[PDB]
Amino acid sequence: LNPESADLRALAKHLYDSYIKSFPLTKAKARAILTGKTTDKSPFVIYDMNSLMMGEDKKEVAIRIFQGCQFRSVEAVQEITEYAKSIPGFVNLDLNDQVTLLKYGVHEIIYTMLASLMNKDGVLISEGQGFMTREFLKSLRKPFGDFMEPKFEFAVKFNALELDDSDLAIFIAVIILSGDRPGLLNVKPIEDIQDNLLQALELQLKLNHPESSQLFAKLLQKMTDLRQIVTEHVQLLQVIKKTETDMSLHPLLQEIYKDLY
């Protein structure tokens, strides 16, 4: 019997709803696919070149896989942007700040949600219809061989927190509404929204994970891991671009990466 708690539950429900609406492949579906539940179908597994050419029925392989990742990332940016607009207060912010928050927030969100599609052995692709093994991704030619490893390392750790979609919905909102982003014009309105989101997240985790002591704090500490993945990725990208002068980068990703840090 607390009305402030009641408003925070209302916010949590709203965010979960928009999340399900914005992201076509949820963690719940991903885990059904990965663990072999009967609600969803088995993926075709790509573990080598033959299986890759087989899978394509249902050029340069490293470059093909890399650009696949890129294209998937641009559609993820599109999904995250539609989600962000559902976050109460976001579209009422200064437009330049909306842009800044998306610019710095989207990649940290991509890697958070990518974890949902991963286990220690590989990653779901093509909306869960495929599974590409971690060893196969590791085996790719020099510059490409290690692009995915840091993401797998983060994911195994992150997934040990056993978050569900209802938790992740609030956490990603919290990520987007970060007042510490470089070049923000009006920090106060953003921190006010984030404070509300943090209250909602704390209550969600206490209610959804009553036996998981300090899960809120542990989750927030993962923001440090996300930030480091993004930094590493950015530097790997600059190596790739200099060594592979014939590989195209999508303009949207290019604009996001422009003087990030």
Ligand X SMILES: CCc1ccc(CCOc2ccc(C[C@H]3SC(=O)NC3=O)cc2)nc1
Binding-site residues for rosiglitazone sit at 70-73, 107, 233, 257
When binding is defined by CB under 6 A, the residue of 32, 63, 69, 156 that contacts ligand X is: 69
**Minimum Å distance from CB 220 to ligand X?**
23
Contact 203, 9 (CB under 8 A): yes
**145 is a site residue for ligand X (CB under 6 A):** no
Q: Of 203, 195, 159, 155, nearest to 177 (Cα)?
A: 195
Question: What residues numbered 94-123 form the site for ligand X, per CB under 6 A?
Answer: 107, 110, 114, 123
Contact 15, 200 (CB under 8 A): yes
Contacts of residue 199, Cβ cutoff 8 Å, sequence gap at least 6 = 8
**125 is a site residue for ligand X (CB under 6 A):** yes
When binding is defined by CB under 6 A, the residue of 51, 81, 86, 126 that contacts ligand X is: 126
When binding is defined by CB under 6 A, the residue of 26, 51, 70, 208 that contacts ligand X is: 70
Nearer to ligand X, 42 or 254 (CB): 254
Contact 79, 112 (CB under 8 A): no
- Number of chain positions touching ligand X (CB under 6 A): 14
Strand order through the sheet with 44-46: 44-46, 130-133, 122-125, 118-119
Q: Which stretch binds ligand X (CB under 6 A): 80-88, 125-133, 158-166, 182-190?
A: 125-133
**Minimum Å distance from CB 72 to ligand X?**
5
Binding site for ligand X (CB under 6 A): 65, 68-70, 72-73, 107, 110, 114, 123, 125-126, 132, 253
